[PDB]
Design a protein around this nucleic acid. Sequence first.
DNA 1: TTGCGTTGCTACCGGTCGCTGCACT
DNA 2: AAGTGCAGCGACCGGTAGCAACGCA
Lengths: 155, 155
Amino acid sequence: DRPREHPFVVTEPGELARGKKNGLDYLFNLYEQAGKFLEEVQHIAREKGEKCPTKVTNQVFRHAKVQGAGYINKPKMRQYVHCYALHCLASDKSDELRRCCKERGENVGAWCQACYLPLIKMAKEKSWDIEGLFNSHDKLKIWYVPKKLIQLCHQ
Amino acid sequence: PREHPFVVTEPGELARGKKNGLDYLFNLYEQAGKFLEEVQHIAREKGEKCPTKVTNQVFRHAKVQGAGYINKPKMRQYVHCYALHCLASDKSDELRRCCKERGENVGAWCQACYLPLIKMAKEKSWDIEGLFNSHDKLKIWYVPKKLIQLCHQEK
DNA sequence: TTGCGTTGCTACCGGTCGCTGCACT
DNA sequence: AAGTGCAGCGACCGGTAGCAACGCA
């Protein structure tokens, strides 16, 4: 029971998946879901007067799992947060990057390495990486900055 | 079961009854060492990765070897003090002898053992890692976070 | 006995490498 | 199916907060 899911594959905005595979608009939505689990946990925290998370803790993951959403797991969500960042911040540029990678016949893996360079430049436009994630956008607030992003960002 | 609480001691000065001295403390790392030695060897024979340092595996090893008394959090707590004993036993010992006068708790002994360390961080251009890497022992012990930042703050 | 403070160490955090499982010749 | 290439996510890592338990008041 509770089986594995089929791989992601690069899509244009709006585009739907090719059967036994998933699109990137799905991927983004997943994060939004995670959000709605953190919402649920936070409520379960006030009641029972426990400490209120503010971010995605392993708890939340555990929680999604038990309500049957294992598809929201820790390593995946980290694997692709750099991209969720891109989508949230400059959906414009995410969208274009998706097209480019689409018509160049890229796999999802390349996309990941690709999505880095814009973010870097966006940081150059600003300064503090954390700032961006740091409650800059209500959606990106709940997620931790990845380590790699931080070090490389300013180099 | 739960080890007798640590209590500050001069060099030598074997403690008595329901307590353990600081010489015993340091002897714990010495032991940990022989466990890493044992692990390293096994890995070779089992053709797996041989660690340069004391990893969760080693701890687990010892527990099996009935030496739970060597555990992760503890060693970490006191890792900074051991550094001193290794590097400048001279200075460590004086810290200890003084501490017999005031008869403070181990908590004090620790949070104080730092001052002399950071002093050594100077001269060596705050290359703590190098410093640990210098001694034959210590090598096997990951520099603690506090030390880096608490040193870094001064910088 | 009665209660507290200190501290040993369970138990879990946030991170993530690299093994499977899966999709195809 | 065996073989290869991808990628999901199990299965740990290194850290450390904070509860019990013990030893002392």
